[PDB]
């Protein structure tokens, strides 16, 4: 209301309204949470079918950036695809220049600088994405990071991105997060996603769960969720 | 007035035509036809007419024919019709202040420039050919 | 912005930069018979600041002094440019650069920044001096690219008042010490009441070379000089 056009200009009270408007763009996006255990990091995304036109296995927001790192994006999908390609490129340069796996702090700092560089100038807009970054290493343990649309990148035990950002972490934080291995945390994330928004505004949603840790020996892939089928036989027991 | 002229108790053959000077500030309740049909404007006269109204007005004085009407005509190329009259009358006044029969060019210059204030037609443009 | 003239007047963005110069810290500089005296007015905001870190009086070569009245952050930039340029002259000609050639090239740089249309002008007015070929000089520049030549001048707050004192006080013939005396007089006319060995900062230019005085001799001299 006065000056919020360019991404270079300041306000009479000193903040950039472009960055705020891009931050609350992801607020309308789907709910995506993440949490780590003592030997791994678990992702989970509330994903919704439009009406009946999807195929249940298209456009998966669970990407796979490096051999041990993947994203859990939410927001504008194509911008997240481009950012995932940039992250693949950065891990490519590191693997080509130093001969070992990228530490997640350095990767997150390069990605944060790339996002900040798209927030700086006036020709371009800030990104409309907010994503998660998990990892595991034998000499480092489990690491879960978090990048906002502005470019502030730091670490968590658990997080949530979407509508129910507070309404997930209200009952995320009552989890005994340290003493659990991630194979419990699979159905834990299942119940957390299943709590929020069963039928209220939309009609139907669908669950994806990504999975990295010591049990994959350092690999990162989606769970065989059909194996052990841990949502629904507990989701039907989570309504009471 | 409107109900009288071109409305009720209509024309028949009653020629009451309304000419003006502007085009803008009027109520369009009569811009629509019927009330008044045709419209005409007026530019300022051209060189062919400039020399014409010159000889019309410069005739009122024993012209010092060495003065260049065409210089006045092209310099004062936007003579609506008042400058011509006023200019020639005041040129005669300038001259006959000295009781001269002819009117040297300088008297015409003074007459016109008194008549023609605030006139700067040079660049622009002013800066061409 | 900077690409188009006014209906009748001048370059408003250069006039505003000149106003920002006139709203700056005061200074005074006097050309005498044998040397040139520069003097600034450097007040710390608090009692916390150190007086050995930032320097107003700054040499360009061993015999060329230079002060300003404006913004240090642009001052240092065009100082560094003048450094590199003077060393390029000394590369080309193997001879220390004359002050007129310095003022030409620095004025060319400032003029190039006054050209269109995305960069702002400097908010810096210089006072350049040096002792080239016996006769010393004094050259003031401005953000507009222009330059002048002074016998004694001032820039900053109350430069008009200090200049009317300079017209009355100064003359044609003095020595460097009497120049420093009248310079601290005309700077003390307009500065605050507490003037110490650190609130001022003075460099001179003898024919033997530039000399940037110390707080020892500055405190010795301005210990109630008159």
């Amino acid at each position: 209301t006065g000056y919020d056009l360019s991404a270079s200009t300041f306000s009479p009270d000193g903040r950039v309204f472009q960055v705020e408007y891009a931050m609350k763009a992801v607020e309308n996006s789907s709910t995506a949470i993440g949490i780590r255990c003592k030997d791994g990091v678990v992702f989970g995304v509330e994903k919704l079918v439009l009406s009946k036109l999807y195929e249940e296995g298209s456009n998966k927001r669970l990407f796979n950036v490096d051999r041990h790192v993947g994203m859990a994006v939410a927001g504008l999908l194509a911008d997240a695809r481009s950012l995932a390609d940039i992250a693949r490129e950065e891990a490519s340069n590191f693997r080509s220049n130093f001969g070992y796996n990228i530490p997640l702090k350095h990767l997150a700092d390069r990605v944060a600088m790339y996002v900040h560089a798209y927030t700086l100038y006036s020709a371009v807009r800030p990104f409309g994405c907010s994503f998660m970054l998990g990892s595991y290493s034998v000499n480092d343990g489990a690491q879960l990071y978090m990048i906002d649309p502005s470019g502030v990148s730091y670490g968590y035990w658990g997080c949530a991105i979407g509508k129910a950002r507070q309404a997930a972490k209200t009952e995320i934080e009552k989890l005994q997060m340290k003493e659990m291995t991630c194979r419990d945390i699979v159905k834990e994330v299942a119940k957390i996603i299943y709590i929020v928004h069963d039928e209220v505004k939309d009609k139907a949603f669908e669950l994806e769960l990504s999975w990295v840790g010591e049990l994959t020996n350092g690999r990162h892939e989606i769970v065989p969720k059909d194996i052990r089928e841990e949502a629904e036989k507990y989701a039907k027991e989570s309504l009471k | 007035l409107l109900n009288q002229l071109d409305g009720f108790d209509s024309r028949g053959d009653v020629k009451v035509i309304m000419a003006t000077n502007r085009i803008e500030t009027l109520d369009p309740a009569l811009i629509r036809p019927g009330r008044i049909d045709r419209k005409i404007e007026f530019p300022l006269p051209d060189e062919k007419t400039k020399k014409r109204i010159f000889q019309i007005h410069t005739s009122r004085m024993t012209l010092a024919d060495d003065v260049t009407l065409d210089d006045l005509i092209m310099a004062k190329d936007d003579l609506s019709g008042a400058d011509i009259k006023a200019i020639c009358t005041e040129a005669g006044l300038m001259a006959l202040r000295e009781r001269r029969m002819k009117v040297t060019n300088e008297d015409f210059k003074k007459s016109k420039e008194n008549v023609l204030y605030k006139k700067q037609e040079g660049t622009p443009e002013g800066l061409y050919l | 912005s900077l690409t188009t003239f006014s209906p009748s007047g001048k370059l408003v963005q250069i006039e505003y930069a000149l106003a920002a110069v006139a709203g700056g810290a005061p200074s005074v500089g006097i050309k005498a018979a044998n040397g040139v005296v520069l003097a600034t007015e450097k007040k710390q905001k608090s009692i916390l600041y150190d007086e050995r870190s930032v320097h107003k009086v700054e040499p360009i070569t061993k015999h060329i002094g230079l002060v300003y009245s404006g913004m240090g952050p642009d001052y240092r930039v065009l100082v560094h440019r003048a450094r590199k340029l003077a060393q390029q002259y000394y590369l080309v000609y193997q001879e220390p650069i004359p002050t007129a050639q310095l003022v030409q090239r620095v004025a060319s740089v400032m003029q190039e920044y006054t050209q269109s249309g995305g960069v702002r002008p400097f908010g810096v007015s210089l006072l350049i001096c040096g002792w080239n070929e016996g006769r010393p000089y004094l050259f003031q520049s401005d953000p507009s690219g222009a330059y002048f030549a002074w016998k004694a001048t001032a820039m900053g707050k109350n430069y008009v008042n200090g200049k009317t004192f300079l017209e009355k006080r100064y003359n044609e013939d003095l020595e460097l010490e009497d120049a420093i005396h009248t310079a601290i007089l005309t700077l003390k006319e307009s500065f605050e009441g507490q003037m110490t060995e650190d609130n001022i900062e003075v460099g001179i230019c003898n024919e033997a070379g530039f000399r940037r005085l110390t707080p020892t001799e500055v405190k010795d001299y301005l210990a109630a000089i008159a």
Partner: protein
């Protein structure tokens, strides 16, 4: 509404309306329908003309030996992405000496159309791609959008009044998966005969069908191997 002019500007509700306007520019194309079986993928479009005497503007165009696209919207961007498509096909056909999988090609299409949707100085592409192909795992029916959010389906339909087509696809998407080519194609035109107002009927010269098969090369048909496809119908239930 004074923020609603360029691609760069985020809205105060976060919805960049240039993307919405490009979507609405896609909504004014011709109707077209693409749907696949387990072994054969068929996309069928609708032709139009400028006048009676002139020929019809074509929609199904060839790309590669196993790739063919439908289209809706602009035609300069259509041929631009066509040339880029053929170029990236013959690039990998040169280098790897294999046919391309479809998914990486459409990812390259999204990465191609990403740049004109984020920087300043290019417009988003008004484009209506319906892509049929063959990787090792059978037919694929993808669709694009000017927002580059490409979708995979089993049967889609884009263009003007294409929603009744979608209702038909809803009530026969279970039936689609089993059948061979002929009744599959006539399900496609039993979507196209509802993409039309009821007072006129689909003739020969205005319809186009392109089949790609697991052993069959991509081939376009026009009126003459379509006269076999147009018989085997009844009237609409008036």
């Amino acid at each position: 509404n004074q923020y609603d002019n360029d691609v760069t500007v985020w809205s105060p509700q976060g919805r960049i309306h240039q993307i919405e306007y490009a979507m609405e520019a896609v909504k004014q194309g011709s109707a077209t329908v693409g749907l696949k079986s387990k072994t054969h993928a068929v996309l069928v479009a609708l032709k139009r003309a400028q006048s009676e005497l002139a020929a019809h503007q074509k929609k199904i165009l060839h790309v590669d030996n196993h790739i063919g696209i439908s289209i809706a919207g602009l035609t300069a961007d259509a041929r631009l992405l066509c040339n880029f498509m053929r170029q990236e096909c013959l690039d990998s056909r040169f280098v790897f000496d294999r046919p391309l999988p479809v998914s990486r090609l459409v990812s390259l299409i999204g990465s191609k159309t990403q740049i004109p949707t984020q920087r300043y100085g290019r417009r988003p592409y008004g484009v209506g791609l319906l892509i049929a192909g063959y990787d090792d795992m059978g037919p694929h029916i993808f669709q694009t959008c000017p927002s580059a959010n490409y979708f995979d389906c089993r049967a889609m339909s884009i263009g003007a009044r294409s929603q009744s087509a979608r209702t038909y696809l809803e009530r026969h998407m279970s039936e689609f998966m089993e059948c061979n080519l002929n009744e599959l194609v006539k399900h496609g035109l039993r979507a196209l005969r509802e993409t039309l107002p009821a007072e006129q009927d689909l003739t020969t010269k205005n319809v186009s069908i392109g089949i790609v098969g697991k052993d069959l090369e991509f081939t376009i048909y026009d009126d003459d191997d379509v006269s076999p496809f147009l018989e085997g119908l009844e009237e609409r239930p008036q």
